[PDB]
Homo-oligomer: A and B are copies of this chain.
Amino acid sequence: HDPLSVQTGSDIPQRDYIKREVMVPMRDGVKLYTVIVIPKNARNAPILLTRTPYNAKGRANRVPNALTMREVLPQGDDVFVEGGYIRVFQDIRGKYGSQGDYVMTRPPHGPLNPTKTDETTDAWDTVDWLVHNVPESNGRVGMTGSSYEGFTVVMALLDPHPALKVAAPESPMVDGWMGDDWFHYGAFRQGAFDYFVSQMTARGGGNDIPRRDADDYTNFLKAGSAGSFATQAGLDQYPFWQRMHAHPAYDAFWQGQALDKILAQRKPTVPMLWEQGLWDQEDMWGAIHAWQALKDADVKAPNTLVMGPWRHSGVNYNGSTLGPLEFEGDTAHQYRRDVFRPFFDEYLKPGSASVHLPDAIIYNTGDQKWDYYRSWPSVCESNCTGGLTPLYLADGHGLSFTHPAADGADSYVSDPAHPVPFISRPFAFAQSSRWKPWLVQDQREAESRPDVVTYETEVLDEPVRVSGVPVADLFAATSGTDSDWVVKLIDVQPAMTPDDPKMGGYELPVSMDIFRGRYRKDFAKPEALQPDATLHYHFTLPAVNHVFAKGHRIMVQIQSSWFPLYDRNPQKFVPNIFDAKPADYTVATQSIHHGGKEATSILLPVVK
């Protein structure tokens, strides 16, 4: 039979870089899948390493099997591809092509991890193997990564290999209870469920949770409590959910995973560049708190904080815009080329010029430029050059820098059957395009509701500059025995913006957060609220570096639900909110006090 005409068998049988796939053994014999991308004719090149739970093979295949290194590696690696670096992506223990048991945000060695290995030792063994088994490299390794990839960098900094010469944790997962991915001051973030099934259903890729309605406001409201939704989704068989469910409060389980505290105790000497977006919608707490903790522990190494006009992980893509907002050029690329690259070159490419970075490099969302701050912040509640400036709530739904002498209060009814949408309906957690820029969305929809109270200054005659961390000084009462308190600090654009009409009167949030009331006194010991008693809440809000220009107004909005992002507070003290029952959800009248000795205000970091 002619083989060029009859087939009785089966028809199934130029690059500027080389890719190597290796199984790196750890101290305990578990081998991790590691991909190494090396430029052709690379010699004595530094190594840029990232450890990830998101498929190393795919991470190094942006354009699958491309002909150029620039195409095969992520957009964020553009400056390093141009600099001639070797790039390494590795699958963390128990994910994709790596062996071992996978533990979600594996705790460091201690009470929560008595084994002989963790993410610090895995990073250690990885760097050791690289400097002894990659001849094209100069033996100098730099670590970087965003989100969970940033968590792995922080974990390496607990006990770094001597060949790790510099680190750049980006929007890292530091404290998941205080203000990163799982909770914000005790208030649970319901998007976590899809993340758990997606990352822990299998070693490799997993799926999302099938939905009934296209709108998650409907899906979660019909299921009732968060635990009820988890049970219906089959999450009760997932070990990490069983632990989280059992630890709703900031007890030993969470305290033992607060990497900002742990890192400050270790005091690393590896140069660090901490980064996060001003509108980071997934890990807002991480970088800034780690950087501040190190700064307070008087760390003996470069320790610079960088904050750009970006959403979560935005630093690795185009930072020219965010939602309807426009910035001065590709701010992400600007940072990667002018700060990130030169800083990494100093420690990874001997003979490279030295850079002297200040305490903080922060984009100014008002002036539309990069600010270099030698010492930062210049104002705060204690041990700073200056103090905070209270912007008090007042009568007539006003805001004034003058303390109102007389007492007063404004009330609103919070009904858990009609919770305030965090963004316009309909929304599903799968809708990435609407999730990413959510923090910069107009708050006018919220202003129009009777379950949201809004205060604003007169139109500004002179600009007010703010740079630092604002603090909510709230004096509020609830008729119930529990409640959540959402406080938003907003820049109201000029009534009319003729050069871009859609922005006229736009209520742009510059900083907002939620606080779960049962933790007012102690995050580790929840207690019921006293009904109808005005109580004092004091908590830090996301950092600002902004200017409220002439023609704008400063606005503050307060409400008691933010759904479906945050589960509903039943407004009745129950042992565990995850297990709240239908009958537990109670309507309550909330009252915000202003003036006198209970003068609610936002402590603003005003600067000259």
Contact = CB atoms under 8 A, between A and B. Distances in A.
Q: Which of A14, A327, A328 has the most CB of B within 10 A?
A: A328
A450 B415 contact: yes
A498 B70 contact: yes
Given A5-B243, A7-B243, A239-B7, A413 B496 contact: no
A325 interface: no
Contact of A237 (B13, B64, B200): B13
A419 interface: yes
Contacts of A253: 5
B9 A101 contact: yes
Count copies of this chain in the complex: 3
Contacts of A301: none
Contacts of A351: none
Contacts of A114: 1, 6, 8
Interface string A12-31: 11100000000000000000
A490 to B, nearest CB: 14
Given A239-B13, A425-B448, A213 B71 contact: no
A103 interface: yes
Nearest to A221: B448
A495 B104 CA distance: 33
A499 B101 contact: no
A329 interface: yes
A57 interface: no
Interface in A90-123: 94, 101-104, 111-115
Interface residues of A, number: 96
Contact of A4 (B67, B246, B424): B246
B12 A207 contact: no
Nearest to A64: B207
A203 interface: yes
Contacts of A210: 63-67
A213 B6 contact: no
Given A214-B502, A253-B5, A504-B213, A420 B448 contact: yes
Nearest to A112: B6
The majority secondary structure among interface residues of chain A is loop
Q: Which of A1, A115, A418 has the most CB of B within 10 A?
A: A418
Contacts of A497: 214
Given A4-B246, A66-B496, A504 B445 contact: no
Contacts of A71: 496, 498
Contact of A328 (B202, B217, B329): B329
Nearest to A329: B328
A294 to B, nearest CB: 28
A442 interface: yes
A579 interface: no
12 contacts: A5-B246, A9-B101, A10-B102, A12-B101, A12-B202, A63-B498, A67-B212, A70-B494, A214-B495, A214-B503, A215-B444, A326-B330
Given A5-B111, A413-B450, 4 more contacts: A12-B94, A71-B496, A214-B495, A418-B450
